[PDB]
Amino acid sequence: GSDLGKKLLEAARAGQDDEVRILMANGADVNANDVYGITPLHLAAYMGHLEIVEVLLKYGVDVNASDQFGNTPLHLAADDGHLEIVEVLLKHGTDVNATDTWGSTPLHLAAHRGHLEIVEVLLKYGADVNAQDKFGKTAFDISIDNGNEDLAEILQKL
Amino acid sequence: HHGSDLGKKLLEAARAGQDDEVRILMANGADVNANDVYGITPLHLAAYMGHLEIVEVLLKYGVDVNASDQFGNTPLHLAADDGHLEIVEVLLKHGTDVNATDTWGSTPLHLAAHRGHLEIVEVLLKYGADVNAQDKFGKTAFDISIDNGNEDLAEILQ
Amino acid sequence: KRIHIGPGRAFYTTXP
């Protein structure tokens, strides 16, 4: 039952790709979640486990899975600066403009953190530069508030 | 002009227990209340990991001692759970809510009870922990001690 | 660090 779900969450957190494959073969739900809606893919993205992300993708993971707070794994990877994970999630069709419960898209989070190379890739995959979070802020607005002139120059042209 | 990613570096330094790095980051304007996507702060991480020197550094810069992450964890929950008596003592002396409840309804007393940290239970009681508080499984700290057959703990909680 | 049951403890668990 959900015993395998707990085991799969932990294997994803620890980066044990062989254990992920074993648990899937045991019948683990690839989209298992804890009481906060957090899935193995969430934990792999948070922890920067590119190989786990790749394996879960092959086993049919849902890259649009959203937790209790509206985070998809793309939110987590974009906020923490994990370029490779951001790229593979986008390449497998994750919603580039998914919004958390405060209306932040991954572009917003990347802007907040000054992750220029992740902003570039998000834009490349169709990030919405005009999207406003619930505070009325676009990514460009965030870069102005933060004094990140490199980020603003990228976004202002758009 | 090119952004400052010191918040992330502080979180990483607190989690890694790099005492000198934390001092240096704080001395150069790092946000003492930086947090990640889940509201986890350097103090949360230092409290769970048992990094007392780092806790004290953050206290020199006016850290929010009662900050809650997205899961309802406060630093006092985390130090009480993982058995870091010295951090529990310090947090209590700096005005942390002794009966704060996480998303499971657990107070720090519940968590210390689950793990058999007798000294922590004692100091929590000294600072007014509520022995009648039931978590969302309906358990008091006393109930947990009985469920775990911990005679010493049951004696402390009467 | 070893995983422990608890709210969001996975995010607090890294390395040993």
Residue numbers in the entry:
A (entry chain C): 11 to 168
B (entry chain A): 9 to 166
C (entry chain B): 5 to 20
What is written in the article reporting this PDB entry?
The V3 loop of the HIV-1 envelope (Env) protein elicits a vigorous, but largely non-neutralizing antibody response directed to the V3-crown, whereas rare broadly neutralizing antibodies (bnAbs) target the V3-base. Challenging this view, we present V3-crown directed broadly neutralizing Designed Ankyrin Repeat Proteins (bnDs) matching the breadth of V3-base bnAbs. While most bnAbs target prefusion Env, V3-crown bnDs bind open Env conformations triggered by CD4 engagement. BnDs achieve breadth by focusing on highly conserved residues that are accessible in two distinct V3 conformations, one of which resembles CCR5-bound V3.
